[PDB]
Structure 1
Amino acid sequence: TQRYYVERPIFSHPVLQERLHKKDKISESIGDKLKQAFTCTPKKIRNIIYMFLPITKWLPAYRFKEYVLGDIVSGISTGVLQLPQGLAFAMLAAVPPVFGLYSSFYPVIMYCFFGTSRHISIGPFAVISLMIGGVAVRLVPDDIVIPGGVNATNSTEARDALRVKVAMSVTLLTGIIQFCLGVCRFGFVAIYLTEPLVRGFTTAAAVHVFTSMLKYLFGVKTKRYSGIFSVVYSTVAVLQNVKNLNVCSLGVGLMVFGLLLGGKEFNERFKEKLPAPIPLEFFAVVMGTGISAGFSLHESYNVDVVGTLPLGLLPPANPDTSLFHLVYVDAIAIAIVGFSVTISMAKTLANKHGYQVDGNQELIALGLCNSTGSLFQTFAISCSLSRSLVQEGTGGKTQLAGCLASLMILLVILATGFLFESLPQAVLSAIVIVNLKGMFMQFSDLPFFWRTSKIELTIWLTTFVSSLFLGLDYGLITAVIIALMTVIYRTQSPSYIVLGQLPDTDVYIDIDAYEEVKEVPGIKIFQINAPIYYANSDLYSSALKRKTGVNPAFILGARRKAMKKYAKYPPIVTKSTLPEELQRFMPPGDNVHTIILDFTQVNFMDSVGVKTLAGIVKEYGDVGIYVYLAGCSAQVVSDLTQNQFFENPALLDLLFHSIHDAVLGSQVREALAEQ
Structure 2
Amino acid sequence: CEDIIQWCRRRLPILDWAPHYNLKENLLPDTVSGIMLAVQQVTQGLAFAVLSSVHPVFGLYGSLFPAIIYAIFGMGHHVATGTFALTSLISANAVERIVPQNMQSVLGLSDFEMQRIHVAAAVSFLGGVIQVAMFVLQLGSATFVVTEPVISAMTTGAATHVVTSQVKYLLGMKMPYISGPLGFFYIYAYVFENIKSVRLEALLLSLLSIVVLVLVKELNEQFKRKIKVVLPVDLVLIIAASFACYCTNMENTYGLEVVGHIPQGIPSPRAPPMNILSAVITEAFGVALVGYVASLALAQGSAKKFKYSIDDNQEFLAHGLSNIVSSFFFCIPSAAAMGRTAGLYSTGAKTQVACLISCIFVLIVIYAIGPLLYWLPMCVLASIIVVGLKGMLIQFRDLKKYWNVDKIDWGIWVSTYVFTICFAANVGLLFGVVCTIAIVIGRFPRAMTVSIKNVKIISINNPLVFLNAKKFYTDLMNMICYLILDCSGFTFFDYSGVSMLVEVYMDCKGRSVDVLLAHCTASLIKAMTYYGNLDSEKPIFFESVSAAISHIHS
TM-score for the superposition, normalised by structure 1: 0.75
Question: In the TM superposition, what is the alpha-carbon distance from 1:659 to its structure 2 partner?
Answer: 4.1
| Counterpart secondary structure, 1:499 | strand
Which structure has the higher relative contact order (CA within 8 Å, separation 6+)? Answer: 2
Question: In the TM superposition, what is the alpha-carbon distance from 1:216 to its structure 2 partner?
Answer: 2.8
1:109 and 2:68 equivalent? yes
Change in 2 beyond 3 A, CA 1:116/1:231: farther
Change in 2 beyond 3 A, CA 1:496/1:360: closer
Change in 2 beyond 3 A, CA 1:239/1:97: same
Matched residue pairs, number? 552
- In the TM superposition, 1:455-466 aligns within 5 A as 456-457=409-410, 460-466=413-419
Question: In the TM superposition, what is the alpha-carbon distance from 1:259 to its structure 2 partner?
Answer: 1.0
Change in 2 beyond 3 A, CA 1:189/1:626: closer
Question: In the TM superposition, what is the alpha-carbon distance from 1:116 to its structure 2 partner?
Answer: 2.0
Equivalent residue number for residue 306 of structure 1:
259
Equivalent residue number for residue 640 of structure 1:
528
CA distance in 2, matches of 1:232, 1:528: 53
Equivalent residue number for residue 391 of structure 2:
438
- In the TM superposition, 1:206-221 aligns within 5 A as 206-221=159-174
Mean Cα deviation higher: 96-105 or 232-241: 232-241
Letter in 1 for 2:290: V
> Could you tell me whether the CA contact under 8 Å between 2:33 and 2:348 is conserved in 1?
yes
> Could you tell me whether the CA contact under 8 Å between 2:159 and 2:393 is conserved in 1?
yes
Letter in 1 for 2:431: T
CA distance in 1, matches of 2:189, 2:544: 64
Equivalent residue number for residue 271 of structure 1:
224
| Residue 410 of structure 1, aligned match among 318, 342, 363 | 363
> Could you tell me whether the CA contact under 8 Å between 1:467 and 1:479 is conserved in 2?
no
Change in 2 beyond 3 A, CA 1:67/1:340: same
Change in 2 beyond 3 A, CA 1:325/1:398: same
CA distance in 1, matches of 2:363, 2:507: 79
1:380 and 2:302 equivalent? no
CA distance in 2, matches of 1:356, 1:242: 53
- In the TM superposition, 1:480-491 aligns within 5 A as 480-491=433-444
> Could you tell me whether the CA contact under 8 Å between 1:229 and 1:471 is conserved in 2?
no
1:84 and 2:43 equivalent? yes
Change in 2 beyond 3 A, CA 1:242/1:624: farther
CA displacement, residues 237-292 of structure 1 (integer Å, 9 cap, x when unaligned): 54555552232222222211111111111111111266212222212322332333
Equivalent residue number for residue 545 of structure 1:
477
CA displacement, residues 21-49 of structure 1 (integer Å, 9 cap, x when unaligned): xxxxxxxxxxxxxxxxxx1x4x852x344
> Could you tell me whether the CA contact under 8 Å between 2:450 and 2:461 is conserved in 1?
no
| Residue 73 of structure 1, aligned match among 32, 36, 53 | 32
Question: In the TM superposition, what is the alpha-carbon distance from 1:226 to its structure 2 partner?
Answer: 4.4
- In the TM superposition, 1:177-216 aligns within 5 A as 177-216=130-169
Question: In the TM superposition, what is the alpha-carbon distance from 1:229 to its structure 2 partner?
Answer: 4.6
> Could you tell me whether the CA contact under 8 Å between 2:75 and 2:315 is conserved in 1?
yes
CA distance in 2, matches of 1:641, 1:543: 23
CA distance in 1, matches of 2:237, 2:528: 70
- In the TM superposition, 1:424-573 aligns within 5 A as 424-454=377-407, 456-457=409-410, 460-496=413-449, 498-501=451-454, 523-546=455-478, 548=479, 550=480
1:620 and 2:508 equivalent? yes
> Could you tell me whether the CA contact under 8 Å between 1:524 and 1:595 is conserved in 2?
yes
> Could you tell me whether the CA contact under 8 Å between 1:124 and 1:381 is conserved in 2?
yes
User: Whose Rg is larger?
Assistant: 1
Letter in 2 for 1:430: S
Change in 2 beyond 3 A, CA 1:453/1:639: farther
> Could you tell me whether the CA contact under 8 Å between 2:449 and 2:471 is conserved in 1?
no
CA displacement, residues 268-321 of structure 1 (integer Å, 9 cap, x when unaligned): 111126621222221232233233334433322212222222124323233332
| Counterpart secondary structure, 1:602 | coil
CA distance in 1, matches of 2:371, 2:151: 40
Letter in 2 for 1:422: W
Equivalent residue number for residue 573 of structure 1:
none
| Counterpart secondary structure, 1:271 | coil
| Counterpart secondary structure, 1:595 | strand
Equivalent residue number for residue 210 of structure 2:
257
Equivalent residue number for residue 177 of structure 2:
224
Change in 2 beyond 3 A, CA 1:184/1:608: closer
> Could you tell me whether the CA contact under 8 Å between 1:176 and 1:367 is conserved in 2?
yes
| Residue 654 of structure 1, aligned match among 537, 540, 543 | 540
Change in 2 beyond 3 A, CA 1:411/1:54: same
Equivalent residue number for residue 340 of structure 1:
293
Question: In the TM superposition, what is the alpha-carbon distance from 1:92 to its structure 2 partner?
Answer: 0.6
| Residue 129 of structure 1, aligned match among 88, 92, 96 | 88
Question: In the TM superposition, what is the alpha-carbon distance from 1:461 to its structure 2 partner?
Answer: 4.5
Percent identical: 33
Question: In the TM superposition, what is the alpha-carbon distance from 1:104 to its structure 2 partner?
Answer: 0.9
Change in 2 beyond 3 A, CA 1:213/1:494: same
Change in 2 beyond 3 A, CA 1:407/1:304: same
- In the TM superposition, 1:17-166 aligns within 5 A as 39=1, 41=2, 45=5, 47-144=6-103, 157-166=110-119
CA displacement, residues 125-162 of structure 1 (integer Å, 9 cap, x when unaligned): 112111222211111111126xx9xxxxxxx9322222
Mean Cα deviation higher: 164-173 or 463-472: 463-472
Change in 2 beyond 3 A, CA 1:654/1:485: farther
CA displacement, residues 297-353 of structure 1 (integer Å, 9 cap, x when unaligned): 332221222222212432323333222132233223322222222222212222211
1:608 and 2:514 equivalent? no
CA distance in 2, matches of 1:158, 1:242: 34
Question: In the TM superposition, what is the alpha-carbon distance from 1:426 to its structure 2 partner?
Answer: 1.9
Change in 2 beyond 3 A, CA 1:599/1:424: same
| Counterpart secondary structure, 1:637 | helix
CA distance in 2, matches of 1:368, 1:298: 42
CA distance in 2, matches of 1:240, 1:634: 74
TM-score for the superposition, normalised by structure 2: 0.90
CA displacement, residues 440-474 of structure 1 (integer Å, 9 cap, x when unaligned): 33333332233344455455445444444443323
> Could you tell me whether the CA contact under 8 Å between 1:630 and 1:658 is conserved in 2?
yes
CA distance in 1, matches of 2:304, 2:492: 32
Q: CA RMSD in A?
A: 2.9
Question: In the TM superposition, what is the alpha-carbon distance from 1:93 to its structure 2 partner?
Answer: 0.9
CA displacement, residues 363-418 of structure 1 (integer Å, 9 cap, x when unaligned): 22222222222211211111122112222332221111111221222222111133
Question: In the TM superposition, what is the alpha-carbon distance from 1:82 to its structure 2 partner?
Answer: 1.6
CA displacement, residues 633-657 of structure 1 (integer Å, 9 cap, x when unaligned): 4454355345x1343277x633343
> Could you tell me whether the CA contact under 8 Å between 1:49 and 1:56 is conserved in 2?
no
Mean Cα deviation higher: 135-144 or 464-473: 464-473
Letter in 2 for 1:532: L
Gaps of 5+ in 2: none
| Counterpart secondary structure, 1:596 | strand
> Could you tell me whether the CA contact under 8 Å between 2:529 and 2:535 is conserved in 1?
no
